[PDB]
Design a protein around this ligand. Structure first.
Ligand SMILES: O=c1ccn([C@@H]2O[C@H](COP(=O)(O)OP(=O)(O)O[C@H]3O[C@H](CO)[C@H](O)[C@H](O)[C@H]3F)[C@@H](O)[C@H]2O)c(=O)[nH]1
Ligand SMILES: O=c1ccn([C@@H]2O[C@H](COP(=O)(O)OP(=O)(O)O[C@H]3O[C@H](CO)[C@H](O)[C@H](O)[C@H]3F)[C@@H](O)[C@H]2O)c(=O)[nH]1
Ligand SMILES: [Mn+2]
Ligand SMILES: [Mn+2]
Lengths: 278, 281
């Protein structure tokens, strides 16, 4: 029974978009009250889940740093469960988790093409959601492993379906977005359409919503295959297609997934997470 | 939650179902897990479980303990396995099922198995204060050299839980292997004692467990200073503690049976059995 005006103050960040045309809030540094939210959610005793895939050298190269920084910055003060999906479990790093953090490892099959490794995540996530995640967490996030938290990534990011603004295009106009522009693809988005360009490196919401998101993207990914076509940015193309039809209830600013390669403009006040120098 | 709701001793008349201080003794057939699961589910309670594996005990019992726990321990409720080992690279990563999760901790290995056993008391406490108190409603501390044979459910939860030792549940208190030397802190005089509790399983709410582990380690340290060591180590201190601070619930030998004894008519359904320690032939 939480109201937007209870934790969100868009007037703190007037230079950027704080609200979508459909009433969905865009969380920027300085517009949220994590103190209120932490109290409100704690009273509900919610549990947050976080899925992550590490296949191949992505394990030695990123998994440890991802987990160590997540244990340190992800929803601090609230129960968290990390679902590690790897192809070689005996290579997974067992870091020491802090208060309210626990994990669970799953051995998955490694896809030959790196593209399928990225896209197959959609199918796997849905299977685990149905199998157990829906019964263990109230909110779930699905992130890339080649990222690193730099600061608090709190409950101010929770919602039915949360989307992340892609660092490079958050200020570009829709007609410039790198959407899949070929009608033969299930991810096809016609010019003159589109709200924002979402990053597939971070997305989430309630187990139910994430299931629909992952289920719908996988279908489209599968359909393109039978049609011998592949979305330009793979699952990200499908994810953007999905968020167009089913708009998110909340969007995270590029501060929750910044690419230091871009530099650090005025708009980026406090980076919560950054891309790895892959 | 009233005892009348789930507990019914009329089902097992041949055995003690109630202590003198009114604590119940859970036996197969006297509990209604169905009702308790409902009450406990609505409460959104999470159950914790500590376990230690140092040296050879990792390869010989850790994997079997967790696999059987993941399958039988508090099924249908959130559970967090707390694994303490001296060598993490040997930690066997088994696939956990719905409502289970865990985290491993690297602990310093002691040079005397007796110290490994007794130190668990100190380590468990430090972890209760550090994080366990903030993650679970009930916690269980078990030996690793055992395996779950069947459902070990919420019918075992309570403020402070004690396990009856399979070999003496029918023995005379004066035959118990309590520490009989008055120079030891674990000392229990002849003519005193209710039951002989198995240190292999014990639990309760984090707070209670913290007190149990704190008081036992204190006794252990005091003995080290008086150059004396309880004949049954931490188990001796635990019995002494459970004598002074009687538990709110007790588990029949069915929750921790030794097949070497065979299988008398009292053990209706084994929930957990001891793992063998040596290959005798
Ligand atoms: O060899 C690999 C390749 C990929 N991955 C997994 O797939 C994710 C995405 O792959 P990349 O990081 O290589 O892709 P990129 O940084 O280009 O990411 C963007 O584009 C991808 C599709 O190309 C996805 O949509 C992704 O979510 C989006 F952030 C990784 O984080 C990782 O969890 C592996 O585990 N091993
Ligand atoms: O080399 C060892 C020896 C012991 N332990 C740990 O200490 C526990 C207790 O040791 P044992 O199982 O070897 O002892 P035992 O079966 O004789 O157990 C009884 O006596 C013990 C003290 O001797 C404890 O009180 C214990 O709880 C009680 F059940 C083990 O399960 C294990 O978790 C190890 O990890 N490595
Ligand atoms: Mn990436
Ligand atoms: Mn033992």
């Amino acid at each position: 029974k939480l109201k937007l005006s209870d934790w969100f103050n868009p007037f703190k960040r007037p230079e950027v978009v704080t609200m979508t045309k459909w009433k969905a809030p865009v969380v920027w540094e300085g517009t949220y009250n994590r103190a209120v939210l932490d109290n409100y959610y704690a009273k509900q005793k919610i549990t947050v889940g976080l899925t992550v895939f590490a296949v191949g050298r992505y394990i030695e190269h990123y998994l440890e740093e991802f987990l160590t920084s997540a244990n340190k910055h992800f929803m601090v003060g609230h129960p968290v469960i990390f679902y590690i999906m790897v192809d070689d479990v005996s290579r997974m790093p067992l870091i020491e988790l802090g208060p309210l953090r626990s994990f669970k490892v799953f051995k998955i099959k490694p896809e030959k093409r790196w593209q399928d490794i990225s896209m197959m995540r959609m199918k796997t996530i849905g299977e685990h959601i149905v199998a157990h995640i829906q019964h263990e967490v109230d909110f779930l996030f699905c992130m890339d492993v080649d990222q690193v938290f730099q600061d608090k990534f709190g409950v101010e990011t929770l919602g039915e379906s949360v989307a992340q603004l892609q660092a490079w295009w958050y200020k570009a106009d829709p007609n410039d977005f790198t959407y899949e522009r070929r009608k033969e693809s299930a991810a096809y988005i016609p010019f003159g359409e589109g709200d924002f360009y979402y990053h597939a490196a971070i997305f989430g919401g309630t187990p139910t919503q994430v299931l629909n998101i992952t289920q719908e993207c996988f279908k489209g990914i599968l359909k393109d295959k039978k049609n011998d076509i592949e979305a330009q940015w793979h699952d990200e193309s499908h994810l953007n297609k999905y968020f167009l039809l089913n708009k998110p209830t909340k969007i995270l600013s590029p501060e929750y997934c910044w690419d230091y390669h871009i530099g650090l403009p005025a708009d980026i006040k406090l980076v919560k997470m950054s891309w790895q120098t892959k």
